[PDB]
Amino acid sequence: PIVQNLQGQMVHQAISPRTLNAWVKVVEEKAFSPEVIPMFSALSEGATPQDLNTMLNTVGGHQAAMQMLKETINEEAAEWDRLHPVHAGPIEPGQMREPRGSDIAGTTSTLQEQIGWMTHNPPIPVGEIYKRWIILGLNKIVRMYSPTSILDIRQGPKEPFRDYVDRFYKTLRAEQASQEVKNWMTETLLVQNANPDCKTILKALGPAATLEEMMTACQGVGGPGHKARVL
Amino acid sequence: PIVQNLQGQMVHQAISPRTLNAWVKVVEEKAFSPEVIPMFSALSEGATPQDLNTMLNTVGGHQAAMQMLKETINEEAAEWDRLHPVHAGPIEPGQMREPRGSDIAGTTSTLQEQIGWMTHNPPIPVGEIYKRWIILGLNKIVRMYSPTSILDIRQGPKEPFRDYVDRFYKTLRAEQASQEVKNWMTETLLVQNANPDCKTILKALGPAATLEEMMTACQGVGGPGHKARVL
Amino acid sequence: QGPKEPFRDYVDRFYKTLRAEQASQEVKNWMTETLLVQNANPDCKTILKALGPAATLEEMMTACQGVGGPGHKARVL
Amino acid sequence: PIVQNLQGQMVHQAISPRTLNAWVKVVEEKAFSPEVIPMFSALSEGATPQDLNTMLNTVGGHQAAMQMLKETINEEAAEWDRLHPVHAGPIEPGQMREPRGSDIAGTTSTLQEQIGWMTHNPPIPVGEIYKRWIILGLNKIVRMYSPTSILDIRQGPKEPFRDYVDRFYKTLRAEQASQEVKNWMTETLLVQNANPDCKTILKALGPAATLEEMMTACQGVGGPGHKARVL
Amino acid sequence: PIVQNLQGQMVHQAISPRTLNAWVKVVEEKAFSPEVIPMFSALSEGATPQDLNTMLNTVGGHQAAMQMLKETINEEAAEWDRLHPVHAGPIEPGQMREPRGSDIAGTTSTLQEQIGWMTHNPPIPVGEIYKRWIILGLNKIVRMYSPTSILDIRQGPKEPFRDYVDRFYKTLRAEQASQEVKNWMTETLLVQNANPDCKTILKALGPAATLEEMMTACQGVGGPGHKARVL
């Protein structure tokens, strides 16, 4: 990564062994789950394309998904390469050149080139651009990998809203469907198999009311919904 | 390892147990597998030749491979010695000598003498050169001890892509990872013995098939690796 | 198409007849668009539809595997 | 055809019954196989689109391959028509006009006009381009009507090895393979399925072996008389 | 081949039909064999590398020998590239381009360049050089592929001095054997198994008799394949 005494960027500093251990743990344990992208964003602060390549190369597991990410990166970099009519590595004195698609992915450019772009005024932030391409490819894998199926889960009589809402929201979050579809889904699949006494109050209040009121209702029936880590 | 706060303040600081335990963990746990090499590359940038020897000698697992690595880098060191038969004339008074291959490997050189070359004007990056020799030797060992053969590894009659692809891509990175070979195998070899439901869709799309389109298919099959595990 | 006739044998026989015979340019274009496939064996015809409705000739001439007799099965030198 | 001359700049003459018979003879005698492809270049040098159309439509044997060859020419003509957007309106009395795809293949152009382009100063080399399209199509039909690529050319279990090296190299010329593939196949797939004596020698010799050593190997196995020593 | 010597303008013309028909006939009749080489040399006079490659590449038979020839040509060309490295090759406005060994072999050159080299001042005789390399490679193939050896030309059980004389000189045609060995074999092995009355006089005549006198000798005393008593 690149550091300086104040907030800016100037000089290179090595990647931390704790960052490497922590990064491997989330990818190996949780796999392609949406919170891994915030964790990747948090751990990749100040990172160069060489550091981002070190992070991708270090992970042993999920080898096909990493290839799908790499093919996504190759395509997105090629899309940038065709879009922007950047010239070769050679440059006139006192200018730092402009990066091509493969320079951003570190294939045709070393660490020094990456530092010269990121430390400039106004900078070219090749780590941010590569990080966006990685996030774009990770989201494609999450869309394939996460969905558990909101349609295929059903609500029994033993779980009212307070208990059911936790597993429903976890399943809904895994589902990658549009926000407009999710607005309909929220007022429909949470009343679909609800018992009629609960169904009536949940239908009346709806998703425009506070979740607290919905949780509170149906207190004399079904599972508890307030125990969190306790069964 | 060598530490340098500002350019021309180069100093040495003793080995970190966090770095050493990370190395000892990966070498015993993950053995001769391709992810150990970039992990080793990440931890070794500030390492001296002396530190690289300490990392090699502290291992107790897999003794035959360690002796093969030492023999392989002795040959790499000899190629440097053959190229450079030291100074043209005698050495200058008080001058740091031209480095030989044994000196780069750290066997014939002191800690002061080896840091001398990395201080030197023009600089000689002896730890980086030794680390390059270790990477070239380690790839040969990782490839030799490999549990799989790239010709053998393919989609069997059971797999709905997902079990096979991870094995194939782990094998492919151990190899040279040729794009021509990957294109030939993906079109031809890897569909040859493949699952009949997956074989028909590959034949149906043909030049419109690719890993993204295939790995998002074969969902009714229920074969190896259809679980899609998330927490 | 004959009962165990290969697709490569069938198209050669069809073209040889076509190519000798005379018909309009439009009618001959229609004959190669759908008449040839209609007069193929039902398994071969199903394979040709499953391959794609407008399928390229290289891919069509390398399709219908196992529908014919043993001579077209598993080609080798 | 059109050929060079010393009393005129070039001289045009009709196709010969000898040259046309020579082309028909190779197609009947030796079929579509790699041997006829450079023969077509040497025999058809200086040819007009009319001479090439005469050669194309005179051949009667291999009717499916002949119709497939025309399909490649139709795609190639379409590709040229698509590539070049020609000048519209009337053809002015002093111009020769830019040819479209169908003009290159002689459909929409009379012989005087075909000769016109080819003999022009500077020229448009229409007969050279159409000859190129035909040889490109010959490779496509040869890949289809050749028995199989090098991958399924597996050595039999008792072979004297001499017919196998002819069979492999006879197949190999009809394949577009890289140098890496040839060395990988020669190490891997030659050894995998073979006569027991021959694989044992070839594995012992290893991938460092030269072609003369390989050509020598299995000595006296195919030797004069009827040979049946080894079971 | 190049044409129109001493006419006041040089011209190029493609391989004649009879040149092809004769080459096809010789290979079909008697393959790559010692008497083929002077006939090939006669047809290769004034040939371009494109003509020579066309002759090699239109032969569909003898493909292991063809691969052995091409590898030997590649090897000979590689030596010529070491002997004659090109400094006058690519340049900004274009130039004649000095031949490397690959240019002579026809792998980095094309027909227009080859015509230009043979029509240069001084002329560069690329076909003469390439023909010599083909002759050297054909001689190596002849030694490999001939099943006879100088041990095998020992005299049959009771033979006349007729057929085995023809075998002996035919075998020695393909071998670089010393003349003094031929004198020893003539008075030992070549007369070894003939009847005592004929055998003793033939050794008594020995190398101090002409082949005519040796063949004239033993009138009515020859072996059962030809007694030599008839008029």
Side-chain angles (χ1 to χ4, degrees):
Chain A
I2 319 181
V3 293
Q4 191 248 94
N5 191 226
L6 304 176
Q7 198 170 293
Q9 295 183 298
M10 180 52 61
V11 63
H12 195 270
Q13 178 175 243
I15 193 165
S16 177
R18 213 279 162 113
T19 302
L20 296 169
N21 292 344
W23 171 237
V24 171
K25 189 180 184 298
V26 286
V27 180
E28 293 288 4
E29 293 180 347
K30 313 203 84 183
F32 303 98
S33 192
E35 61 268 51
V36 182
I37 296 173
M39 192 66 169
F40 178 60
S41 196
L43 293 177
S44 58
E45 288 297 311
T48 62
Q50 176 60 100
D51 304 307
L52 296 170
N53 280 318
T54 301
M55 291 178 177
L56 297 177
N57 298 341
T58 300
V59 182
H62 312 283
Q63 302 85 349
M66 293 299 174
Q67 180 63 9
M68 192 184 296
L69 179 57
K70 184 64 57 156
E71 295 188 2
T72 302
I73 290 162
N74 292 338
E75 187 207 295
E76 195 62 24
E79 193 195 287
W80 184 281
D81 192 64
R82 293 186 288 99
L83 183 54
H84 299 118
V86 185
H87 291 194
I91 186 63
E92 301 187 293
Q95 286 183 48
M96 59 171 184
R97 217 259 300 177
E98 196 186 305
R100 304 160 293 196
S102 286
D103 298 308
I104 299 171
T107 302
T108 47
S109 281
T110 60
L111 183 63
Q112 311 92 301
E113 318 300 271
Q114 304 167 22
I115 297 167
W117 290 323
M118 290 163 66
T119 57
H120 187 254
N121 297 308
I124 311 179
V126 292
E128 285 282 289
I129 302 169
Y130 193 22
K131 189 186 304 173
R132 288 175 177 113
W133 299 349
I134 297 166
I135 291 169
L136 183 68
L138 288 171
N139 278 308
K140 183 191 289 183
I141 305 164
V142 174
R143 290 192 296 260
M144 180 177 71
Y145 196 82
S146 191
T148 303
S149 191
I150 199 67
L151 190 60
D152 286 290
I153 62 165
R154 295 88 182 183
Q155 186 175 8
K158 71 290 205 293
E159 56 222 318
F161 194 94
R162 204 174 191 148
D163 187 43
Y164 194 61
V165 68
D166 184 65
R167 60 190 67 100
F168 190 84
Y169 271 132
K170 182 170 171 55
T171 308
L172 191 67
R173 174 177 174 256
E175 204 70 58
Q176 57 74 70
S178 184
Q179 202 278 330
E180 175 65 48
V181 183
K182 294 187 167 179
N183 295 311
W184 168 74
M185 196 168 278
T186 307
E187 58 168 55
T188 307
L189 297 185
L190 285 165
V191 296
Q192 183 185 245
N193 310 117
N195 295 316
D197 304 323
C198 290
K199 194 196 296 285
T200 298
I201 183 62
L202 295 172
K203 173 265 193 180
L205 293 173
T210 187
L211 202 71
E212 182 185 358
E213 202 68 68
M214 302 290 266
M215 289 263 196
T216 302
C218 302
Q219 51 277 92
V221 292
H226 53 266
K227 299 182 73 179
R229 66 179 178 110
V230 189
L231 299 167
Chain B
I2 49 168
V3 181
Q4 182 169 222
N5 291 127
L6 293 170
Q7 187 62 45
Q9 300 186 2
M10 192 182 289
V11 295
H12 185 276
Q13 296 183 15
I15 197 167
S16 174
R18 180 183 64 175
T19 302
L20 187 56
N21 285 310
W23 175 242
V24 174
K25 178 58 179 181
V26 302
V27 76
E28 302 193 316
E29 186 78 290
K30 298 177 182 294
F32 306 122
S33 191
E35 54 262 59
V36 181
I37 322 188
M39 187 64 173
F40 181 69
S41 199
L43 298 177
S44 53
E45 297 293 272
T48 62
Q50 189 175 262
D51 304 308
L52 295 171
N53 295 314
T54 302
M55 292 175 79
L56 186 57
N57 290 316
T58 42
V59 197
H62 285 294
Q63 256 296 285
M66 304 307 160
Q67 305 308 318
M68 193 189 293
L69 201 156
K70 291 165 187 275
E71 195 66 66
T72 302
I73 68 86
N74 288 352
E75 190 64 54
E76 292 299 306
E79 287 286 85
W80 183 280
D81 196 287
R82 294 162 196 151
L83 181 62
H84 306 102
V86 303
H87 314 104
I91 196 172
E92 306 306 298
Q95 163 63 4
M96 183 53 63
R97 66 196 176 87
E98 187 76 345
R100 308 184 71 137
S102 291
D103 298 305
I104 298 180
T107 185
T108 45
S109 56
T110 62
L111 190 59
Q112 187 184 122
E113 192 169 66
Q114 71 196 251
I115 297 172
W117 291 312
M118 301 187 286
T119 301
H120 201 269
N121 203 280
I124 309 88
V126 297
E128 195 63 37
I129 298 167
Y130 190 18
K131 201 261 291 307
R132 182 236 296 173
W133 297 345
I134 298 167
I135 290 179
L136 295 172
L138 188 55
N139 273 283
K140 183 175 68 179
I141 298 170
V142 168
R143 199 165 183 248
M144 182 159 280
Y145 276 65
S146 196
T148 51
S149 176
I150 199 69
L151 187 66
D152 186 52
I153 297 298
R154 63 189 70 165
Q155 194 171 1
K158 296 185 64 180
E159 292 86 74
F161 302 115
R162 306 203 177 178
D163 173 282
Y164 123 71
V165 289
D166 284 346
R167 305 171 194 264
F168 186 74
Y169 290 113
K170 187 170 187 283
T171 309
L172 191 65
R173 61 175 69 154
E175 308 295 87
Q176 306 81 14
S178 182
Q179 192 67 62
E180 276 294 301
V181 178
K182 191 271 187 179
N183 293 355
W184 182 39
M185 288 184 171
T186 50
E187 192 183 10
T188 308
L189 185 64
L190 303 173
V191 63
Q192 187 174 266
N193 296 110
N195 184 259
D197 284 84
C198 296
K199 187 185 284 182
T200 300
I201 58 174
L202 196 291
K203 286 185 164 181
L205 297 186
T210 184
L211 181 61
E212 192 188 303
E213 301 292 308
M214 292 293 101
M215 197 171 179
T216 48
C218 293
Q219 306 295 288
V221 182
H226 71 277
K227 57 181 63 175
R229 63 99 184 174
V230 177
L231 304 176
Chain C
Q1 196 175 18
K4 289 297 185 181
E5 184 173 49
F7 194 65
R8 290 186 181 193
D9 280 52
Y10 173 52
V11 301
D12 202 266
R13 189 161 63 91
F14 195 97
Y15 298 140
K16 192 171 77 196
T17 305
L18 186 71
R19 186 183 65 164
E21 293 290 274
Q22 302 289 269
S24 89
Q25 184 65 236
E26 294 63 45
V27 172
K28 288 191 163 177
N29 293 350
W30 176 81
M31 288 170 168
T32 47
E33 97 172 51
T34 196
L35 192 67
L36 188 157
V37 181
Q38 185 263 283
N39 286 268
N41 291 322
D43 292 277
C44 189
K45 188 174 73 194
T46 307
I47 292 167
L48 292 165
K49 297 301 178 185
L51 182 63
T56 52
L57 195 57
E58 177 184 355
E59 288 294 291
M60 296 199 299
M61 286 183 169
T62 318
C64 301
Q65 314 296 23
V67 185
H72 86 301
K73 290 173 70 189
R75 301 168 65 238
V76 75
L77 178 52
Chain D
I2 320 178
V3 298
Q4 304 182 250
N5 193 266
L6 279 63
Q7 291 79 60
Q9 186 166 4
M10 295 191 86
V11 63
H12 164 58
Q13 70 297 129
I15 196 170
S16 181
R18 191 178 190 154
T19 52
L20 190 55
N21 191 67
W23 176 241
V24 177
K25 182 180 189 293
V26 298
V27 178
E28 284 183 60
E29 192 170 294
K30 310 192 188 304
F32 293 122
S33 181
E35 45 264 57
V36 308
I37 311 182
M39 188 272 187
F40 189 80
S41 286
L43 190 59
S44 318
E45 186 59 290
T48 60
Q50 183 173 297
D51 307 308
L52 297 168
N53 284 333
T54 304
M55 291 169 172
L56 181 62
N57 290 283
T58 302
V59 294
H62 310 287
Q63 193 65 198
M66 187 270 191
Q67 192 61 49
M68 185 61 207
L69 183 58
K70 290 191 175 184
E71 192 63 56
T72 75
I73 294 168
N74 292 336
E75 287 303 316
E76 211 57 39
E79 181 171 347
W80 197 269
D81 193 63
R82 189 167 65 222
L83 181 59
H84 302 90
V86 306
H87 61 102
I91 305 305
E92 196 177 61
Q95 63 169 239
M96 59 179 164
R97 93 182 168 95
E98 182 170 354
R100 297 182 69 166
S102 291
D103 297 304
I104 306 296
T107 316
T108 44
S109 187
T110 197
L111 184 62
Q112 194 290 125
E113 187 175 61
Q114 295 172 31
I115 294 167
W117 290 312
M118 295 165 68
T119 58
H120 198 267
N121 295 297
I124 301 178
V126 179
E128 190 71 73
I129 296 165
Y130 192 20
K131 185 210 300 172
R132 222 284 153 211
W133 297 357
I134 298 169
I135 63 175
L136 182 64
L138 291 176
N139 288 309
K140 180 69 69 171
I141 66 176
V142 166
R143 192 171 174 107
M144 295 169 66
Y145 274 85
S146 190
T148 186
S149 189
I150 59 174
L151 298 175
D152 289 292
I153 309 300
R154 304 299 177 102
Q155 187 185 124
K158 286 297 300 179
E159 292 207 66
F161 188 38
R162 302 290 177 255
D163 192 62
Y164 185 74
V165 295
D166 275 303
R167 194 187 307 137
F168 176 47
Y169 296 129
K170 190 178 297 174
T171 305
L172 190 60
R173 54 162 188 168
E175 186 51 59
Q176 51 71 74
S178 72
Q179 318 309 348
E180 314 91 60
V181 175
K182 301 173 197 181
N183 286 287
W184 184 76
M185 192 282 182
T186 307
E187 195 191 322
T188 310
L189 200 64
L190 175 58
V191 183
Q192 184 178 325
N193 307 110
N195 184 1
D197 301 86
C198 300
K199 59 163 70 191
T200 303
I201 299 167
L202 291 163
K203 187 67 263 181
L205 293 172
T210 58
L211 187 58
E212 61 282 4
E213 196 69 61
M214 295 162 58
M215 196 67 77
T216 305
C218 302
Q219 188 60 236
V221 182
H226 302 304
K227 287 282 182 290
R229 303 162 294 156
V230 187
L231 192 64
Chain E
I2 203 71
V3 296
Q4 301 294 87
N5 294 281
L6 303 179
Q7 297 295 291
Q9 191 189 132
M10 298 301 293
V11 165
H12 190 263
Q13 176 54 244
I15 294 165
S16 203
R18 192 170 185 141
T19 307
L20 182 61
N21 301 334
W23 176 235
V24 169
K25 179 63 71 186
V26 176
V27 178
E28 190 169 307
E29 184 174 74
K30 54 167 66 90
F32 300 135
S33 299
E35 52 279 278
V36 183
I37 308 182
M39 189 162 186
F40 186 72
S41 191
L43 299 176
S44 295
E45 184 57 59
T48 58
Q50 183 72 337
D51 301 306
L52 296 171
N53 287 322
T54 300
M55 293 174 187
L56 298 180
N57 296 338
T58 196
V59 175
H62 304 284
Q63 296 296 294
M66 188 54 64
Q67 180 58 230
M68 189 174 177
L69 189 59
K70 286 176 179 286
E71 190 63 43
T72 303
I73 290 164
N74 194 84
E75 209 65 69
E76 204 58 44
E79 197 75 289
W80 197 276
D81 264 87
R82 294 183 294 244
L83 291 166
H84 298 99
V86 49
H87 162 76
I91 199 172
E92 180 184 71
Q95 67 180 333
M96 187 205 74
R97 196 173 71 97
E98 291 278 308
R100 78 208 289 184
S102 299
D103 295 318
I104 300 180
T107 49
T108 51
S109 68
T110 190
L111 180 54
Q112 179 58 53
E113 306 194 276
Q114 297 169 15
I115 294 166
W117 295 325
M118 297 175 76
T119 53
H120 190 255
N121 182 253
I124 309 176
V126 294
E128 182 68 60
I129 303 169
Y130 193 17
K131 177 206 65 168
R132 191 165 68 242
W133 301 357
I134 299 168
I135 292 170
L136 293 171
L138 289 171
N139 279 271
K140 190 179 186 177
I141 294 167
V142 158
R143 293 187 291 257
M144 183 64 74
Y145 274 60
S146 299
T148 189
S149 73
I150 64 172
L151 200 77
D152 293 286
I153 53 182
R154 60 184 176 266
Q155 191 183 42
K158 51 176 70 174
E159 282 285 312
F161 202 76
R162 289 283 164 149
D163 300 294
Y164 272 71
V165 185
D166 193 287
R167 302 292 197 284
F168 186 90
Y169 283 104
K170 184 168 175 171
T171 296
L172 291 167
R173 187 176 61 160
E175 193 72 71
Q176 303 176 27
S178 195
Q179 205 292 309
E180 57 172 294
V181 185
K182 305 174 185 173
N183 301 319
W184 168 67
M185 294 192 296
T186 297
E187 72 165 305
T188 58
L189 304 181
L190 188 58
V191 294
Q192 194 177 65
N193 295 321
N195 69 92
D197 296 321
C198 194
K199 174 172 171 175
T200 53
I201 189 61
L202 292 174
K203 193 175 174 68
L205 289 168
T210 64
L211 199 67
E212 178 182 59
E213 291 299 306
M214 295 287 280
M215 195 170 287
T216 304
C218 303
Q219 298 180 355
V221 204
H226 190 56
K227 209 94 176 191
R229 52 188 166 202
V230 295
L231 299 175

